[model samples]
Target: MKIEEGKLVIWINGDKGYNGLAEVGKKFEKDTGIKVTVEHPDKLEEKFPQVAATGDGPDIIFWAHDRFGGYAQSGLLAEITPDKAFQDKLYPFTWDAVRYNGKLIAYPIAVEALSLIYNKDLLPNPPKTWEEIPALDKELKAKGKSALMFNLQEPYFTWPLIAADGGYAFKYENGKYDIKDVGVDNAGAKAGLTFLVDLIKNKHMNADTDYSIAEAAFNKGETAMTINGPWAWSNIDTSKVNYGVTVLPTFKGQPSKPFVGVLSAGINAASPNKELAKEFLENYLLTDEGLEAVNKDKPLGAVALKSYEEELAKDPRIAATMENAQKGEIMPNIPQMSAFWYAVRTAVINAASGRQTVDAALAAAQTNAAAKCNTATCATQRLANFLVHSSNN
Candidate 1:
């Protein structure tokens, strides 16, 4: 691809981090004399492909790396290849996260994962392992406090449990995801889900947990510890609750590996300004000036760049996020993953609510997910249906 001189526009997701990139966009305009329009669409992920298919979307789009595979495979995303010097500047895992089918599909901007956030006044020390949780819960319940909490109904938060013991959505092979090799029904998943059920059965946690309840419990001081991501930090007033963030405790002797999500910048393949957008992202946005400008508005996880290592280390939250990222697996960004989410959500809810045995729930999840996308073609067809619906509106 050749770099072109022209005005550029980026269809950024309507989130704190992406919205903050406007300052970086301004700097790009000043330095390159190219007018840069940064748009915060309410649902850019759903709208980008629709508008781009009609050649009316922005030159660039921002979203989590997991979505990159769908866009890239649809021929709607431009491929990116950072030079060795540029690649060396980023954390290897961040680079890996943005790559789809062995090709770099985007520029990773920020990384996030679930971490254990605890009220320091209530629990001076967070549990280091899952075995310690029961005793801790007993201690907290004595004072009318819960040991820890999270949205048990949400599959995203529950996946770490299954993943910690080697379960994965699909088998990754030769830089590509083997969608046919689903692992949700494997032994690791059974073990993990069983453990979660045991937690509820033993009265360590409530079966009716959801995001609101967990956040409210922690904020109102009803819970001493909670598992959450950086997005929740904004809602938590540190002054009202002295809280500290750390990597989640181990499960079954292995670290609980949360899904590390990378927010990335990808160019629209159909955009007329693809070349200019590419230049802006690879040359400008990855630099300290650009990263700093965006972080000023809202800190986006531990940034992918090594340049901010020292600065990020100074913030314990950032340190905890990075630490978890090191141990976590990147959230799979394949089209088949779409089915996995809904199926697992149902399975987790049922298992937590005691409506189904852990093994049965997981088996049902696998069966349902497989029926939804039994092959690569099925996954592609599902995406096509989504695009058709979006285009109709």
Candidate 2:
């Protein structure tokens, strides 16, 4: 696989980013005569590790950053170290997402985080604190409207409030996630989840709210604000709603931090075309031109490239998205994080719907999560169990 005639195979998920990169592959071939072949397969995430282990996977893979840690831990992903100048060009959070155990494991392309999307027509100014929401709700209700809405059934949307008040699934220490210290049922999480429950019980927010309902309510001008990310923009009828975006409001003067998710490309260590893959990513994909081509179908969240950020900021959506991304905690990429979603989802939905008390619900979630070894000594054991299962199959 010499540079002059090397062919780089890439496995991409079926997404706008992947489709856009197919175009960039053509440009790479035209410029360098190094054929860049891209393929989008269903269930790529499920299939990647098995194929990569057999040395039959693509040289590069386009996927979300959250999966990078699993691949890295399995010795499936290559460590990607670009020049310092190139590294310096990415936003800090974007770079952080691609790192696993302090090693650069992926090339970040785009970032996403939740922000407060509101109707400018209802409120002259957005509230700066959660304390103001109840009053705003009363004011709106008096006028036969709702102040705010969000996907109450989804924990991803609800975790920010828990995390904002100092709750977390795992603690970071010495540049690694200490999975032993789970925080979902901690004091801070209890407080945060309680506040959410109160809102639903008091009729400040609807108990049945989910993404579709919340988005519809906001788009139809029934709610003044909603908690959502840029991906929800397509569902919004801006003409009717006159929407605006801002950082999620503070809770008791504390910032409402959201999870920052990044879309990235990782190189497979087992691939024969490792050098060509590195060149394709560092010299081409990380450049302003390549990023620009990738973002051709409107900007997807905030792009990671600093060179294009100034241009991206020109759009209000990207500006607001970047601002929120800066205030977020990078979603931990460890495989142990898989235990968190189901537990949090059950707890959040039960508490929100009055099926269980906040304390009871969260405590049960924490116990169940801990039993899964997502905490304490169980982290390694769980990983070992997974590896054994993988080997058996």
Candidate 3:
């Protein structure tokens, strides 16, 4: 291999992103005498393509599957085929998470989903369904507390319940996502939204609540239950409250399955070290030791691959995240997701603000997916204006 091919770069945006990979790189250097650059850059997501366009980005990027469809469509990614042995180490869901247009675009690392977080001290047993939540609200309200609380303005938290009512952001089939199919304005979605409005109507939750408020209140142990992911444990004030994590409660008879996100490694198509990057992924990061290195720094919620089940069961936080992930829906990794996020936010904000009629605002929320990737109806000027509008209050 040429000297340049002997070196490889990787970009990671993660909790404690550097330690484990860097340490493993040292071992890789000795074994094959190859150099690995494991970098944790600022705003890694927004910068990848800009630098990749100029041939200045890493040979590999470790990120969530959400952006892969656009990246692969943009010709910014290189497809990788893990041999049979390596493929067996991965969970079936990881394949579904990383594939785009019937091809694998990345390899999985960590898996996560929003689980039900509750204070053990405040309630010995958490409610099992949305219907049961009303009874707890009756008791918690008497003591000046709340039964459940979350950001009313963000759809990530609401998607779980909305999905239970048969609402969906995008339609997915055997192996592909139909970005044109949007269901946020459907009758099922409106039903879910009405339930949330009822929560505020009955004084069970605050209409003004957002993620920051809910997370802070939960950490302080002032709130009884909230919907959040396992990564939250690191920032949680354990001294202030003892907590438990579990699968989200059902809505009516349907399960509350949140969007599942996986952290994966993708090879850059432009990199001269494509072969070297693949080797690094298979030899170092995919192994038990490499996986442990990353998981050790932060609990890592759970692994997307097949290993670590036994040890994962010991930690309630990680185990619950794993189980919840098992019951979750893989986040759509397509550019059409821009439409989903935009339409849902508009619907949530308008209804929560009471500035417009509830269901009417939702139907009006669907905007053309013209400004997004693949369908670039807008350029620099519109891009600037798009950000101006996409900003959430």
Instruction: Using lDDT, give the best candidate's number.
Output: 1
Taking the tens digit of each residue's C-alpha lDDT, what string does model 1 give over 279-360? 7887788888788777766667788888875576688898899798788888888765657776788778778877777777
Backbone clash count, each prediction separately? 0, 1, 0
How would you order the candidates by TM-score, starting with the best?
3, 1, 2
Error of 3 at 386 (Å): 10
Candidate that beats the other on lDDT, 2 or 3, i.e. the better one: 2
Question: Distance (Å) between predicted and true CA of 207, model 3?
Answer: 5.0
- lDDT accuracy of residue 287 in candidate 2: 80
**What's the distance in Å from true for residue 264, model 1?**
1.2
What is the lDDT of every predicted structure here? 0.79, 0.78, 0.74
Cα-based TM-score, every candidate: 0.82, 0.79, 0.83
Higher-scoring candidate on TM-score, 1 or 2: 1
Which ranges in model 1 have alpha carbons more than 4 Å from their true place? 1-15, 30-43, 173-176, 201-208, 237-240, 370-393
lDDT of 2 by residue, 50-115 (tens): 788777777888777876777888788988888888888887868888888779999998888889
Q: Candidate 1: what lDDT?
A: 0.79
Please give the TM-score that candidate 3 achieves against the real structure: 0.83
